[model samples]
Target: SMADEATRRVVSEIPVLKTNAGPRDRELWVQRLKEEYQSLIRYVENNKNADNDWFRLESNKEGTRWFGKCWYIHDLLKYEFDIEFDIPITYPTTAPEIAVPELDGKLAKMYRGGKICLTDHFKPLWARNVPKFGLAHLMALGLGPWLAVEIPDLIQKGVIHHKEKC
Candidate 1:
């Protein structure tokens, strides 16, 4: 079908890596980014096949930034919003910062621009996995857990509206 064909064409045109590493680390980061991209694609594919649509992720052709959306489904409430991640030049050494645009300034465990506070627990882990912690891993270990903790409370406490109101 033309729909599938269009999708294949669009996907193939998207570059696998979008980075601006210096000559000293260009090759290394490119290879690492490629590996991370492949892993992310496989992760999303597996989730889609299993009928799980909790999250979606996309990156630009240059790979400098990644955009995503994640959801938290509880009882009759579903909290879904946009998220963005920017890769650092020192990437592999530092994890990409994650942010939820809608949740900005509404949550406690978050920094400016909805960047979830990943200190105490996750910062140490990110340091340990330097260069290995990809976007998929960040979503699973960081955003997923944050949603597990915050979403229910927000709905129950009325910070975010209840589904019945909608």
Candidate 2:
């Protein structure tokens, strides 16, 4: 089960994830986590070097994480940005919030809050899941692409490109 796997990995690979008591260790662990996530997302967004989707680093501070999004969402070419943070859950089952302040000219449902109930903890999704996906798909697909398709301008402006450039 995913819970088992996440537990095993978290326990074995990332021991710090088990405790949020020590502020300094917590900060270091969180920084490492964010760096790993940010690096993956940046690579995916920039690997092709295409000028679409337009993901930017909006914020990074102590105990805080943020991301910005600008993409075509219809004829409107919607633009918005948002951030997320951690919350408590059972051992390995908690999915962090991935929020957007607004989408396609409208405020997001999870605004001011974080996204929950992620689908990547299960079998099929887990099969496709990678460390890179922890960041890339979390933003590009998990959050942004759906919004892009809902609005026409985003497609016209090239919101989500799932192809590789050789």
Candidate 3:
């Protein structure tokens, strides 16, 4: 399918963002980027695309960050952030701390805290059968699948408006 090719094409086109990203984080980001790219492409193809010029996904020593794109269909996406994982990679069994940037643009008020949900396919905790999934999978599953869709306008608005308010 076009999507499969598109995913591969993107993987080749981009240098595969790397930098202190764990296997889990890498898989998560890759999957997320592919989905986002596909969504944007589909929108463009359907002529219903909203401009995401402000959108960007990047990696750093701290972790990964996504910005610009809207949160859900009706809600504008503000920012989604993930802290880097270290050591045994199991200290925080679920996931590392996630920081959602408030509209005030400060990395604060991440409701989910350090641990986010893992995939249904795998055991809830870090077990012997995690497979080879990496950052790409983590971002897609923990951040995108569970969190992204549930973000509401109020959350987005609060995040944006309250950074300075509080």
Candidate 4:
């Protein structure tokens, strides 16, 4: 990952998701298709071009249920985690519930299932930009901060371990 401030730049400029439409929309599936993929595409594209790409994500069907991996390389110790999130039924206006289950019992700032606690200044920030933020926007903002803050401490605390070689 890039420096903390560097990510701030990226997030500030990350493409705004196209529409406020969500899974709850009955017949706006066309808009759902556009809003979902187009928004997520630009989000993913930005990360790739920035070369700070730290994770991969896949959305099932409506881009509501997702699974992915985000790995942070700390002093060459690549700490990887299993990530999952489902778009709230009120998405675009609500935050994606992200998780790093591997660190469930380890983090104090999490829900019961390891959903990273994102209730800081982060919560309403998404609320304010109801139309602009996309999935990867939250991915970059939410997951990025958590990884940056926690991984180093976890390393120092010897909380996460990796193999001897490869």
Best by lDDT: 4
> Per-residue lDDT of 7-109 in model 3, one digit per residue for the tens?
3442332223222323256666455445434543443333233343222334443334322322333334344333343323342233343344332233232
- Which tens-of-lDDT digit does each residue in 50-115 have in candidate 1? 665688888776677789788777884667778998877767567777888787888788887778
Q: What residue runs in model 4 are displaced by over 4 Å at the alpha carbon?
A: 1-8, 27-30
Candidate 3: where are CA atoms >4 Å away? 1-56, 61-71, 75-94, 103-131, 153-166
Compared with the true structure, model 3 gives a TM-score of 0.34
Instruction: Give a tens-digit lDDT track for model 4, residues 68-161.
Output: 8987887765767889988787877878888888788886777887888875767866776676777767877677887888788877887777
Give the C-alpha lDDT of model 4.
0.74
lDDT of 2 by residue, 1-166 (tens): 8755654442232212223221245655575456545555564456346555455544455434546554443333344444444432321133345655333234233333434233444324423433223444344444454454444543345553333234
Q: What are the C-alpha RMSDs, in order, of all predicted structures?
A: 10.0, 9.2, 10.1, 3.8
Clashing pairs in 4: none
Q: CA shift at 8, candidate 1, in angstroms?
A: 33
lDDT of each: 0.69, 0.42, 0.37, 0.74
